[PDB]
């Protein structure tokens, strides 16, 4: 919240300023002292976010998520196939979810390296439901990798978190 | 207190605070149009990002078309208690009933602006 | 549909075409006299009255201030400076056909002239009662126009004193004052009518305080410039 004032408020304001100081610089010539001229979120409830995308291949998007998700204190998780969860005080979650959206270019190309040596890549993102939850089981984020769509279920299963994913 | 059930757009103590600052913001960015009628004309004119009215107005119907003007324009529209209040946030000592917050090129105040939207059509019910 | 409103304004509107057309007919009627009593009209000013006088004069105007009621239509220091222009006049007898067309115009003017005022009184009196403070204001008929423009009193409150401000500049009130205040004096009228018409859409100060505060709140500013 913010007081702006006016024409006259400025000068009285720089004049009586202005005055006090030069008045007792005056006196300090008479008397000759001068010579003369933590992870955020909330306990009660739990905002919470999930994210749904084609490709997770790049490593620097596979880092980053990583990073964050640990420097936030963001609970949650990540799977994918051989989807994006995470809970936090609201304030976490929306630096998160800027990241995902505004900041990291899923559709953008990069070179990969694999155990013979480096090759080219060349997937979007896109939000399903931000809410509030009774509990938020997760315990850690835990990125890991399903072969299954099943599996990938009972993963979230393990969570009762089965119905998080979207066909 | 009570206020004229007609200042439709009410904002709380909270979004009060939030409103005014970034009326103050807009001012000092040269996006902030003050009085009923030239936000009158920045409705007609197609530039109006939201619209912020006085429920202070001794003449309650003396800004009464600007929701009209909006719904039909499809801009944002909120109301504050005091119009002291708002004229401070103009820069200006007199009180000011209504004034408008415009579209700017590339605005810095942009990510301000949407969120301060949102919130106003979240109290349109 | 049928607001009342729309019903006044055109009631209004008819009351110009009348203004007009007795404005024309007492220049006719005036040329036509001529012939018997050419000075008349520098005597009597006031259209009506001198209309009025021509009919009640007629082709005899000697005597004329012995008439009972000519004297109920002009003033007795005026009436005796027609009656003595009246014996020196330089214009001959009418003739019984332009007597007689003389007369028949005469009759349709203040037939037309009674009918302004019929409607006039209509005007007002719905006027005062759709718009009580707007027209206190600026009047009954100026406060229609500026209606019917705008398109009903909801129509007009949803507009900015800028775009009401024209029929302002026209009204009485307006032009009561000397030329070079005109200009600064409309746009304070029309400023004041926005509030007025405002409170108006909602049906308040239904006997016209508003209204009122505001005209004196102008008269006093008009006195400041003097």
């Known amino acids: 919240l913010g007081v702006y004032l006016t024409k006259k408020e400025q000068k009285k304001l720089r004049r009586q300023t202005r005055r006090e100081a030069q008045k007792e610089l005056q006196e300090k010539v008479r008397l000759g002292l001068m010579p003369p001229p933590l992870k955020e ?3 009660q409830g739990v905002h919470i976010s999930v994210y749904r995308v084609r490709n997770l291949s790049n490593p620097a998007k596979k880092f980053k998520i990583e990073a964050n998700a640990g420097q936030l204190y963001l ?9 994006v969860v995470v809970e936090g005080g609201p ?8 990241l995902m959206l505004h900041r990291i270019k899923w559709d953008e190309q990069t070179s990969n390296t694999k155990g013979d040596d480096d090759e080219e890549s060349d997937n979007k993102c896109v939000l399903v439901w931000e809410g509030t939850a009774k509990d938020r089981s997760f315990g850690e984020m835990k990125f890991k990798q399903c072969p299954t769509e099943n599996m990938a279920r009972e993963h979230f299963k393990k969570h009762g978190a089965e119905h998080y994913w979207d066909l | 207190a009570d206020v004229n059930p007609k200042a439709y757009p009410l904002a709380d103590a909270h979004l009060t605070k939030k409103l005014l600052d970034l009326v103050q913001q807009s001012c000092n960015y040269k996006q902030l149009r003050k009085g009923a009628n030239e936000a009158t004309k920045t409705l007609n004119r197609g530039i109006s990002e939201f619209i912020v009215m006085a429920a202070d107005a001794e003449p309650l119907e003396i800004i009464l078309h600007l929701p009209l003007l909006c719904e039909d324009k499809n801009v944002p529209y909120v109301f504050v208690r005091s119009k002291q209040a708002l004229g401070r946030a103009c820069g200006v000592s007199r009180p000011v009933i209504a004034c408008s917050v415009t579209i700017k090129e590339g605005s810095q105040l942009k990510q301000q602006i949407q969120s301060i939207q949102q919130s106003i059509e979240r109290l349109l019910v | 549909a049928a607001p009342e409103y729309r019903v006044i304004v055109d009631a209004n509107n008819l009351t110009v075409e009348i203004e007009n057309e007795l404005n024309i007919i007492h220049k006719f009627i005036r040329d036509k006299y001529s012939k018997r009593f050419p000075e008349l009209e520098s005597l009597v000013p006031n259209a009506l009255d001198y209309i009025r006088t021509v009919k009640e004069l007629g082709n005899s105007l000697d005597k004329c201030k012995n008439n009972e009621n000519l004297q109920q239509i002009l003033t007795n220091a005026t009436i005796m400076v027609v009656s003595v222009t009246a014996s020196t006049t330089q214009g001959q007898q009418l003739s019984e056909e332009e007597l007689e067309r003389l007369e028949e ?12 005022h019929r409607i006039y009184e209509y005007v007002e009196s719905r006027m005062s009662f759709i718009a009580p403070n707007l027209s206190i204001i600026i009047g009954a008929s100026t406060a229609a126009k ?15 004193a800028c775009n009401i401000m024209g029929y302002i500049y026209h009204s009485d009130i307006v032009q009561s004052l000397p030329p070079d205040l005109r200009r600064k004096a409309a746009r304070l009228v029309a400023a004041k009518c926005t509030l007025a018409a405002r409170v108006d859409s909602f ?7 508003v209204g009122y505060e505001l005209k004196d709140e102008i008269e006093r500013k008009f006195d400041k410039w003097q």
């Open chain 1, 41 to 43: 979120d909330i306990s």
């Open chain 1, 75 to 83: 609970t949650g998780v990540v799977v994918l196939h051989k989807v």
């Open chain 1, 91 to 98: 304030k976490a979650q929306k630096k998160f979810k800027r």
């Open chain 3, 105 to 116: 115009a005469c009759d349709m003017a203040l037939e037309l002239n009674a009918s302004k």
């Open chain 3, 146 to 160: 500026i209606m019917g423009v705008a398109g009903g009193l909801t129509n007009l409150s949803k507009m900015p």
């Open chain 3, 203 to 209: 049906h308040e100060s239904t006997e016209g305080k």
